[PDB]
Amino acid sequence: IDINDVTPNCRVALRNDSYTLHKILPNKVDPLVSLMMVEKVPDSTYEMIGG
Amino acid sequence: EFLHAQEEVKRIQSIPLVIGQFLEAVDQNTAIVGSTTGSNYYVRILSTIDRELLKPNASVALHKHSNALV
Amino acid sequence: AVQKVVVHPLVLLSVVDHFNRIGKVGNQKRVVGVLLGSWQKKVLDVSNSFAVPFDEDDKDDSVWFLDHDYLENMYGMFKKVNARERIVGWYHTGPKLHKNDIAINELMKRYCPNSVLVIIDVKPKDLGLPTEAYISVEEVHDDGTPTSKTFEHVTSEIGAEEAEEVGVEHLLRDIKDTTVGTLSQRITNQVHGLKGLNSKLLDIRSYLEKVATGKLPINHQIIYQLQDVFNLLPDVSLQEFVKAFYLKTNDQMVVVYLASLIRSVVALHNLINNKIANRDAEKKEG
Amino acid sequence: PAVDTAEQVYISSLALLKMLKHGRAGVPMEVMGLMLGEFVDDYTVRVIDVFAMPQSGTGVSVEAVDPVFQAKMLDMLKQTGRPEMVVGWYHSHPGFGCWLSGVDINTQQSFEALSERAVAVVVDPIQSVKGKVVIDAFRLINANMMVLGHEPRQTTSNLGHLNKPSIQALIHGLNRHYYSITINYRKNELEQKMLLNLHKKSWMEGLTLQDYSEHCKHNESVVKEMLELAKNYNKAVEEEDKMTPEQLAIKNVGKQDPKRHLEEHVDVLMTSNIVQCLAAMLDTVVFK
Predict the structure, then answer these.
(1) For chain D, which end, N or C, has fewer CB atoms within 10 Å of the first or last residue's CB respectively?
(2) Does C210 map to a domain?
(3) Closest chain A residue to D170 measured between Cα atoms?
(4) Where in the numbering of this chain does the MPN domain appear (chain C)?
């Protein structure tokens, strides 16, 4: 891991023994903001909207 | 040897496991588990587990010593 | 009384070690030691055993020296190390009981009223457990026969705790059969059970021959236990049982047939896939 | 002179079991005991018996070795036939791995004062919970020779570098103040044919026909789940999507329908049925 890739608030993982960073890990997202990301697209389509 | 390895994998799950909350899966063969002890950990997921069951936040039993999700 | 005796693995390795060390320097038949364990409701659980000096004379059969002070000092040391273990009996590696075993059992009873003699054979026998827990019983025999000290038998089984289990698993990780009912191990076990049944039947037949020839006394008890065994025979070839058993065999064979069909289809699919892969590789070669 | 990395602390079958039992008795605290064995030669330290020393408020320290208790124990074990010397000491490290602390190093030096080869053993009853037995043998590295010479152990052979140091032992001082010794388990038959009796299976177990009620229930459940799995296998094979099929077989690898939950169940069913039928026929023949 290069020091340039660890941007502030990156949620790194530290080894238990010596606490060395060995991964970057996905950035932390508040649990409740994650549910607001549409992972399953809704079924409505443009042809269903009329007028 | 394969039978012994299967028995070893089954013995990884050996009862006294700490219950934890699955926070988010970094990638297959690993994930972040929030142990009920009060510390967030980065652990290694077991292959035999069902990936579908890994909801966004579900109760996952973790190995007491290695803390790997089992 | 004692409904059962559980001899933990360490007791066995301690009794194998004692026999080896005494046999290596000098030669002595049998090896006597004191067994330490805890009492459940009725299941005595032997965990540790320590050697006690023991000289005997096979010719006289009544001369035998067992340390009293040595036994008490060893028990005190072990109580200091772990007080949960109280003396529960004695063990001797001699394959067969001995005429002086009753006196030793009384001496042990001096330290524990409910003494169990576990005969821990140090000769590997493939058919049967290596322990035989015996107890002393004084009765009137009911059936108008002279009474004597004798040795009543109590069921014995070898269990283990977590630490001893881990040690055993590490020790026998190179000669241990895989846990799981592989067909090879199942068929081998069935063969082993047939062999054990044959050995038990041969022993019973030898005893019956001895009783008939008079070499051994007609018990008048246990014998009718063999009679009850012979009454409990399945009595196969009854028409109703035959029909039911044929029904069960066919019901299992239909499932086996479905499994065979699935296996054949999977094998054929794999063969088709491999053939197509080989043909594609050959075609892409040129 | 110098210690070869080929030295091997031979731990007998009885010794390992006794040490594990003593360590598991003490948890949550730390137990200690003297190890009885022989310094057979320079490249081997054989331990035959280990006797626990009584738990004391001092802990695992030079004052845990009650001189009266040790003297009387050795004197009484000599009579039985075990005239062995004190080759080393063992203490349980509950939770943490096999390493040595400062007090441990002081006790090890005190033991070395008697004999230069007094090996020290550390056993963790909590880590050794499964087929893994976390047992290490440690001896002190003369911090002097750290500069006077270089490392402490000659490497005249490859019998020692076939093992790996542990981050834990490294952090607590491994190859710095303490050096591990390869632990070889001295096991023999008689002591391995007696231990294959913990679970030996009686002859009767190999002639019991299970119970036909739950056997039928298990067969029915497995057959129904195999019917569902055959539906899934049908869907997977009939699809046979050729959009880079080599990639398709790798993008759907999840231990699923094709063969894993497939013929695995066929093997389970057929093994159970064949074994049950063979046992039934063997009983029909043997018993009348």
Answers:
(1) N
(2) no
(3) A17
(4) 5-140
